[PDB]
mmCIF file of all heavy atoms in Angstrom:
data_model
loop_
_atom_site.group_PDB
_atom_site.id
_atom_site.type_symbol
_atom_site.label_atom_id
_atom_site.label_comp_id
_atom_site.label_asym_id
_atom_site.label_seq_id
_atom_site.Cartn_x
_atom_site.Cartn_y
_atom_site.Cartn_z
ATOM 1 N N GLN A 20 -41.114 -28.903 -45.735
ATOM 2 C CA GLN A 20 -41.927 -29.631 -46.694
ATOM 3 C C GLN A 20 -41.805 -29.092 -48.109
ATOM 4 O O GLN A 20 -42.257 -29.762 -49.042
ATOM 5 C CB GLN A 20 -43.398 -29.609 -46.262
ATOM 6 C CG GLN A 20 -43.981 -28.216 -46.225
ATOM 7 C CD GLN A 20 -44.463 -27.743 -47.566
ATOM 8 O OE1 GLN A 20 -44.880 -28.537 -48.404
ATOM 9 N NE2 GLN A 20 -44.405 -26.439 -47.785
ATOM 10 N N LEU A 21 -41.241 -27.899 -48.299
ATOM 11 C CA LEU A 21 -41.160 -27.343 -49.639
ATOM 12 C C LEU A 21 -39.785 -27.519 -50.283
ATOM 13 O O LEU A 21 -39.667 -27.343 -51.501
ATOM 14 C CB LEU A 21 -41.578 -25.862 -49.599
ATOM 15 C CG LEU A 21 -41.787 -24.988 -50.842
ATOM 16 C CD1 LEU A 21 -42.785 -23.905 -50.475
ATOM 17 C CD2 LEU A 21 -40.512 -24.349 -51.372
ATOM 18 N N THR A 22 -38.753 -27.897 -49.513
ATOM 19 C CA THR A 22 -37.453 -28.241 -50.080
ATOM 20 C C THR A 22 -37.002 -29.675 -49.820
ATOM 21 O O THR A 22 -36.192 -30.190 -50.597
ATOM 22 C CB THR A 22 -36.356 -27.305 -49.548
ATOM 23 O OG1 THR A 22 -36.147 -27.556 -48.151
ATOM 24 C CG2 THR A 22 -36.728 -25.853 -49.752
ATOM 25 N N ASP A 23 -37.513 -30.336 -48.778
ATOM 26 C CA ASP A 23 -37.015 -31.630 -48.304
ATOM 27 C C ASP A 23 -35.535 -31.498 -47.922
ATOM 28 O O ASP A 23 -34.641 -32.144 -48.470
ATOM 29 C CB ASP A 23 -37.256 -32.726 -49.355
ATOM 30 C CG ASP A 23 -36.928 -34.132 -48.858
ATOM 31 O OD1 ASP A 23 -36.059 -34.308 -47.985
ATOM 32 O OD2 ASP A 23 -37.532 -35.087 -49.384
ATOM 33 N N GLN A 24 -35.320 -30.601 -46.956
ATOM 34 C CA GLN A 24 -34.061 -30.379 -46.252
ATOM 35 C C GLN A 24 -34.371 -29.684 -44.935
ATOM 36 O O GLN A 24 -35.100 -28.690 -44.919
ATOM 37 C CB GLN A 24 -33.056 -29.518 -47.030
ATOM 38 C CG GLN A 24 -32.477 -30.092 -48.302
ATOM 39 C CD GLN A 24 -31.499 -29.142 -48.977
ATOM 40 O OE1 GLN A 24 -31.290 -28.016 -48.527
ATOM 41 N NE2 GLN A 24 -30.904 -29.596 -50.075
ATOM 42 N N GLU A 25 -33.876 -30.212 -43.827
ATOM 43 C CA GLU A 25 -34.043 -29.510 -42.568
ATOM 44 C C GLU A 25 -33.480 -28.093 -42.706
ATOM 45 O O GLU A 25 -32.351 -27.921 -43.190
ATOM 46 C CB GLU A 25 -33.368 -30.274 -41.420
ATOM 47 C CG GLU A 25 -31.839 -30.179 -41.335
ATOM 48 C CD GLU A 25 -31.240 -31.051 -40.238
ATOM 49 O OE1 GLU A 25 -31.604 -30.860 -39.058
ATOM 50 O OE2 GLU A 25 -30.393 -31.926 -40.560
ATOM 51 N N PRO A 26 -34.242 -27.065 -42.352
ATOM 52 C CA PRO A 26 -33.758 -25.689 -42.507
ATOM 53 C C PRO A 26 -32.786 -25.297 -41.410
ATOM 54 O O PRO A 26 -32.360 -26.146 -40.622
ATOM 55 C CB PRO A 26 -35.044 -24.865 -42.447
ATOM 56 C CG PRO A 26 -35.929 -25.668 -41.553
ATOM 57 C CD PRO A 26 -35.640 -27.108 -41.896
ATOM 58 N N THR A 27 -32.410 -24.021 -41.355
ATOM 59 C CA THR A 27 -31.450 -23.550 -40.375
ATOM 60 C C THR A 27 -31.927 -22.223 -39.798
ATOM 61 O O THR A 27 -32.554 -21.420 -40.491
ATOM 62 C CB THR A 27 -30.065 -23.417 -41.029
ATOM 63 O OG1 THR A 27 -29.488 -24.717 -41.199
ATOM 64 C CG2 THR A 27 -29.135 -22.576 -40.197
ATOM 65 N N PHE A 28 -31.627 -21.997 -38.522
ATOM 66 C CA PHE A 28 -31.987 -20.764 -37.837
ATOM 67 C C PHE A 28 -30.770 -19.871 -37.629
ATOM 68 O O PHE A 28 -29.632 -20.341 -37.585
ATOM 69 C CB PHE A 28 -32.651 -21.045 -36.485
ATOM 70 C CG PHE A 28 -34.020 -21.668 -36.584
ATOM 71 C CD1 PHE A 28 -34.628 -22.203 -35.465
ATOM 72 C CD2 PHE A 28 -34.722 -21.671 -37.778
ATOM 73 C CE1 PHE A 28 -35.889 -22.759 -35.541
ATOM 74 C CE2 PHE A 28 -35.991 -22.219 -37.859
ATOM 75 C CZ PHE A 28 -36.573 -22.762 -36.747
ATOM 76 N N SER A 29 -31.030 -18.569 -37.506
ATOM 77 C CA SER A 29 -29.998 -17.556 -37.323
ATOM 78 C C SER A 29 -30.385 -16.615 -36.195
ATOM 79 O O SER A 29 -31.528 -16.145 -36.142
ATOM 80 C CB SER A 29 -29.768 -16.758 -38.606
ATOM 81 O OG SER A 29 -29.643 -17.620 -39.718
ATOM 82 N N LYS A 30 -29.414 -16.323 -35.327
ATOM 83 C CA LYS A 30 -29.552 -15.530 -34.114
ATOM 84 C C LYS A 30 -29.316 -14.044 -34.373
ATOM 85 O O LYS A 30 -28.726 -13.647 -35.376
ATOM 86 C CB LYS A 30 -28.576 -16.017 -33.042
ATOM 87 C CG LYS A 30 -29.029 -17.273 -32.318
ATOM 88 C CD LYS A 30 -27.844 -18.100 -31.848
ATOM 89 C CE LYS A 30 -28.256 -19.107 -30.794
ATOM 90 N NZ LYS A 30 -28.686 -18.488 -29.508
ATOM 91 N N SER A 31 -29.772 -13.228 -33.424
ATOM 92 C CA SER A 31 -29.783 -11.775 -33.552
ATOM 93 C C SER A 31 -28.485 -11.191 -33.005
ATOM 94 O O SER A 31 -28.121 -11.442 -31.851
ATOM 95 C CB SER A 31 -30.992 -11.193 -32.819
ATOM 96 O OG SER A 31 -31.028 -9.778 -32.887
ATOM 97 N N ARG A 32 -27.793 -10.414 -33.838
ATOM 98 C CA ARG A 32 -26.472 -9.906 -33.480
ATOM 99 C C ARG A 32 -26.550 -8.876 -32.361
ATOM 100 O O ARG A 32 -25.815 -8.962 -31.370
ATOM 101 C CB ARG A 32 -25.803 -9.303 -34.714
ATOM 102 C CG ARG A 32 -25.256 -10.316 -35.697
ATOM 103 C CD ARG A 32 -24.850 -9.678 -37.027
ATOM 104 N NE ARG A 32 -24.632 -8.231 -36.965
ATOM 105 C CZ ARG A 32 -23.609 -7.634 -36.358
ATOM 106 N NH1 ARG A 32 -22.684 -8.353 -35.732
ATOM 107 N NH2 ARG A 32 -23.520 -6.312 -36.369
ATOM 108 N N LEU A 33 -27.435 -7.902 -32.500
ATOM 109 C CA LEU A 33 -27.574 -6.799 -31.564
ATOM 110 C C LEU A 33 -28.957 -6.817 -30.937
ATOM 111 O O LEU A 33 -29.751 -7.738 -31.144
ATOM 112 C CB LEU A 33 -27.327 -5.454 -32.247
ATOM 113 C CG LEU A 33 -25.877 -4.999 -32.407
ATOM 114 C CD1 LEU A 33 -25.281 -4.800 -31.027
ATOM 115 C CD2 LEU A 33 -25.046 -5.958 -33.240
ATOM 116 N N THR A 34 -29.230 -5.776 -30.158
ATOM 117 C CA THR A 34 -30.551 -5.488 -29.623
ATOM 118 C C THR A 34 -31.047 -4.198 -30.267
ATOM 119 O O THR A 34 -30.530 -3.113 -29.985
ATOM 120 C CB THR A 34 -30.523 -5.360 -28.100
ATOM 121 O OG1 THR A 34 -30.148 -6.608 -27.507
ATOM 122 C CG2 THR A 34 -31.889 -4.934 -27.569
ATOM 123 N N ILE A 35 -32.051 -4.315 -31.129
ATOM 124 C CA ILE A 35 -32.760 -3.135 -31.602
ATOM 125 C C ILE A 35 -34.139 -3.182 -30.965
ATOM 126 O O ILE A 35 -35.057 -3.824 -31.490
ATOM 127 C CB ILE A 35 -32.858 -3.088 -33.137
ATOM 128 C CG1 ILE A 35 -31.466 -3.102 -33.778
ATOM 129 C CG2 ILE A 35 -33.611 -1.840 -33.568
ATOM 130 C CD1 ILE A 35 -30.581 -1.940 -33.414
ATOM 131 N N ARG A 36 -34.289 -2.520 -29.814
ATOM 132 C CA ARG A 36 -35.571 -2.531 -29.117
ATOM 133 C C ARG A 36 -36.636 -1.781 -29.906
ATOM 134 O O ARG A 36 -37.829 -2.068 -29.767
ATOM 135 C CB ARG A 36 -35.404 -1.942 -27.716
ATOM 136 C CG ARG A 36 -36.651 -1.983 -26.857
ATOM 137 C CD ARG A 36 -36.356 -1.458 -25.475
ATOM 138 N NE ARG A 36 -37.529 -1.437 -24.607
ATOM 139 C CZ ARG A 36 -37.505 -1.030 -23.345
ATOM 140 N NH1 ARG A 36 -36.364 -0.616 -22.803
ATOM 141 N NH2 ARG A 36 -38.608 -1.047 -22.619
ATOM 142 N N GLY A 37 -36.228 -0.826 -30.742
ATOM 143 C CA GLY A 37 -37.169 -0.248 -31.688
ATOM 144 C C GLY A 37 -37.779 -1.296 -32.598
ATOM 145 O O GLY A 37 -38.985 -1.282 -32.854
ATOM 146 N N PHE A 38 -36.956 -2.226 -33.090
ATOM 147 C CA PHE A 38 -37.438 -3.321 -33.927
ATOM 148 C C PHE A 38 -38.012 -4.480 -33.119
ATOM 149 O O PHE A 38 -38.670 -5.350 -33.696
ATOM 150 C CB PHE A 38 -36.303 -3.810 -34.842
ATOM 151 C CG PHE A 38 -36.702 -4.920 -35.781
ATOM 152 C CD1 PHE A 38 -37.468 -4.658 -36.904
ATOM 153 C CD2 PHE A 38 -36.280 -6.219 -35.556
ATOM 154 C CE1 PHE A 38 -37.821 -5.672 -37.776
ATOM 155 C CE2 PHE A 38 -36.635 -7.235 -36.423
ATOM 156 C CZ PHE A 38 -37.411 -6.955 -37.532
ATOM 157 N N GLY A 39 -37.784 -4.513 -31.810
ATOM 158 C CA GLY A 39 -38.429 -5.477 -30.941
ATOM 159 C C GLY A 39 -37.722 -6.811 -30.819
ATOM 160 O O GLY A 39 -38.376 -7.857 -30.793
ATOM 161 N N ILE A 40 -36.394 -6.802 -30.743
ATOM 162 C CA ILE A 40 -35.622 -8.040 -30.691
ATOM 163 C C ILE A 40 -34.519 -7.920 -29.652
ATOM 164 O O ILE A 40 -33.835 -6.895 -29.571
ATOM 165 C CB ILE A 40 -35.041 -8.412 -32.070
ATOM 166 C CG1 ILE A 40 -34.078 -7.334 -32.571
ATOM 167 C CG2 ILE A 40 -36.153 -8.684 -33.069
ATOM 168 C CD1 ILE A 40 -33.315 -7.740 -33.792
ATOM 169 N N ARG A 41 -34.374 -8.959 -28.834
ATOM 170 C CA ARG A 41 -33.195 -9.125 -27.998
ATOM 171 C C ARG A 41 -32.097 -9.745 -28.861
ATOM 172 O O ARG A 41 -32.243 -9.885 -30.078
ATOM 173 C CB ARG A 41 -33.531 -9.972 -26.775
ATOM 174 C CG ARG A 41 -34.947 -9.765 -26.254
ATOM 175 C CD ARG A 41 -35.152 -10.372 -24.873
ATOM 176 N NE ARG A 41 -35.086 -9.364 -23.815
ATOM 177 C CZ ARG A 41 -36.085 -8.555 -23.478
ATOM 178 N NH1 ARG A 41 -37.244 -8.628 -24.114
ATOM 179 N NH2 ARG A 41 -35.924 -7.668 -22.503
ATOM 180 N N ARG A 42 -30.978 -10.123 -28.246
ATOM 181 C CA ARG A 42 -29.876 -10.739 -28.994
ATOM 182 C C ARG A 42 -30.051 -12.247 -29.170
ATOM 183 O O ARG A 42 -30.207 -12.735 -30.290
ATOM 184 C CB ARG A 42 -28.550 -10.418 -28.307
ATOM 185 C CG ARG A 42 -28.236 -8.937 -28.259
ATOM 186 C CD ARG A 42 -26.753 -8.743 -28.057
ATOM 187 N NE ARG A 42 -26.032 -9.758 -28.807
ATOM 188 C CZ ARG A 42 -24.965 -10.398 -28.359
ATOM 189 N NH1 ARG A 42 -24.486 -10.127 -27.157
ATOM 190 N NH2 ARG A 42 -24.386 -11.314 -29.118
ATOM 191 N N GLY A 43 -30.053 -12.992 -28.072
ATOM 192 C CA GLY A 43 -30.028 -14.441 -28.160
ATOM 193 C C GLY A 43 -31.215 -15.067 -28.860
ATOM 194 O O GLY A 43 -31.302 -16.293 -28.975
ATOM 195 N N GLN A 44 -32.138 -14.231 -29.329
ATOM 196 C CA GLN A 44 -33.356 -14.719 -29.952
ATOM 197 C C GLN A 44 -33.075 -15.324 -31.317
ATOM 198 O O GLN A 44 -32.230 -14.838 -32.075
ATOM 199 C CB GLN A 44 -34.371 -13.581 -30.087
ATOM 200 N N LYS A 45 -33.798 -16.393 -31.626
ATOM 201 C CA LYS A 45 -33.840 -16.940 -32.976
ATOM 202 C C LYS A 45 -34.588 -15.951 -33.853
ATOM 203 O O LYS A 45 -35.818 -15.894 -33.823
ATOM 204 C CB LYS A 45 -34.540 -18.293 -32.974
ATOM 205 C CG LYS A 45 -33.813 -19.388 -32.227
ATOM 206 C CD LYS A 45 -34.586 -20.693 -32.293
ATOM 207 C CE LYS A 45 -33.822 -21.823 -31.631
ATOM 208 N NZ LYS A 45 -33.667 -21.656 -30.168
ATOM 209 N N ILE A 46 -33.862 -15.157 -34.640
ATOM 210 C CA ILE A 46 -34.530 -14.178 -35.488
ATOM 211 C C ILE A 46 -34.960 -14.799 -36.814
ATOM 212 O O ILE A 46 -36.159 -14.865 -37.116
ATOM 213 C CB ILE A 46 -33.667 -12.916 -35.683
ATOM 214 C CG1 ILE A 46 -34.365 -11.959 -36.648
ATOM 215 C CG2 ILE A 46 -32.230 -13.217 -36.105
ATOM 216 C CD1 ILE A 46 -33.729 -10.616 -36.729
ATOM 217 N N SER A 47 -34.017 -15.297 -37.609
ATOM 218 C CA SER A 47 -34.346 -15.665 -38.979
ATOM 219 C C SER A 47 -34.265 -17.170 -39.201
ATOM 220 O O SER A 47 -33.674 -17.908 -38.413
ATOM 221 C CB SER A 47 -33.425 -14.955 -39.974
ATOM 222 O OG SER A 47 -32.246 -15.698 -40.183
ATOM 223 N N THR A 48 -34.875 -17.617 -40.300
ATOM 224 C CA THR A 48 -34.718 -18.979 -40.787
ATOM 225 C C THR A 48 -34.383 -18.939 -42.270
ATOM 226 O O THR A 48 -34.762 -18.006 -42.978
ATOM 227 C CB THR A 48 -35.971 -19.831 -40.550
ATOM 228 O OG1 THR A 48 -35.697 -21.192 -40.895
ATOM 229 C CG2 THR A 48 -37.129 -19.339 -41.388
ATOM 230 N N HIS A 49 -33.635 -19.938 -42.735
ATOM 231 C CA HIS A 49 -33.286 -19.980 -44.147
ATOM 232 C C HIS A 49 -32.843 -21.381 -44.545
ATOM 233 O O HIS A 49 -32.593 -22.250 -43.707
ATOM 234 C CB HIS A 49 -32.210 -18.942 -44.487
ATOM 235 C CG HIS A 49 -31.100 -18.879 -43.491
ATOM 236 N ND1 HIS A 49 -29.968 -19.655 -43.595
ATOM 237 C CD2 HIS A 49 -30.952 -18.145 -42.365
ATOM 238 C CE1 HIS A 49 -29.170 -19.400 -42.576
ATOM 239 N NE2 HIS A 49 -29.744 -18.489 -41.814
ATOM 240 N N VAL A 50 -32.753 -21.582 -45.860
ATOM 241 C CA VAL A 50 -32.388 -22.873 -46.434
ATOM 242 C C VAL A 50 -31.749 -22.615 -47.792
ATOM 243 O O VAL A 50 -32.032 -21.606 -48.443
ATOM 244 C CB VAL A 50 -33.630 -23.799 -46.530
ATOM 245 C CG1 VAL A 50 -34.637 -23.245 -47.521
ATOM 246 C CG2 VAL A 50 -33.245 -25.221 -46.875
ATOM 247 N N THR A 51 -30.842 -23.504 -48.201
ATOM 248 C CA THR A 51 -30.184 -23.398 -49.502
ATOM 249 C C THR A 51 -30.388 -24.679 -50.307
ATOM 250 O O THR A 51 -30.080 -25.779 -49.839
ATOM 251 C CB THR A 51 -28.695 -23.044 -49.365
ATOM 252 O OG1 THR A 51 -28.206 -22.563 -50.625
ATOM 253 C CG2 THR A 51 -27.846 -24.215 -48.905
ATOM 254 N N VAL A 52 -30.946 -24.525 -51.504
ATOM 255 C CA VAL A 52 -31.232 -25.628 -52.410
ATOM 256 C C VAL A 52 -30.331 -25.531 -53.634
ATOM 257 O O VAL A 52 -29.852 -24.451 -54.012
ATOM 258 C CB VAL A 52 -32.717 -25.679 -52.817
ATOM 259 C CG1 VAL A 52 -33.586 -25.910 -51.604
ATOM 260 C CG2 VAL A 52 -33.130 -24.388 -53.470
ATOM 261 N N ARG A 53 -30.059 -26.696 -54.223
ATOM 262 C CA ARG A 53 -29.162 -26.820 -55.363
ATOM 263 C C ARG A 53 -29.635 -27.890 -56.334
ATOM 264 O O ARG A 53 -30.258 -28.881 -55.950
ATOM 265 C CB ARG A 53 -27.732 -27.149 -54.934
ATOM 266 C CG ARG A 53 -27.092 -26.021 -54.203
ATOM 267 C CD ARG A 53 -25.700 -26.333 -53.793
ATOM 268 N NE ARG A 53 -25.123 -25.208 -53.075
ATOM 269 C CZ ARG A 53 -23.913 -25.235 -52.556
ATOM 270 N NH1 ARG A 53 -23.198 -26.322 -52.723
ATOM 271 N NH2 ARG A 53 -23.423 -24.190 -51.913
ATOM 272 N N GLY A 54 -29.286 -27.689 -57.597
ATOM 273 C CA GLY A 54 -29.545 -28.667 -58.625
ATOM 274 C C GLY A 54 -30.897 -28.457 -59.272
ATOM 275 O O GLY A 54 -31.505 -27.378 -59.213
#
């Protein structure tokens, strides 16, 4: 709703159990705007 573009998800490369993440998990989200 803040860019009017479907965003994109990014998966976790490794397992850092200290940080609390498996690999196949959807870790991050991001979007790129222009103009």
Side-chain angles (χ1 to χ4, degrees), residues 20-43 45-54:
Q20 63 84 30
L21 188 153
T22 68
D23 188 331
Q24 293 180 357
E25 76 185 301
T27 284
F28 291 168
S29 313
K30 281 150 163 293
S31 179
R32 284 169 19 71
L33 277 296
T34 296
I35 301 299
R36 184 177 178 179
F38 182 76
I40 62 171
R41 326 193 101 81
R42 298 201 38 221
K45 294 180 176 67
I46 176 170
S47 87
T48 187
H49 44 90
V50 66
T51 197
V52 298
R53 292 180 180 177

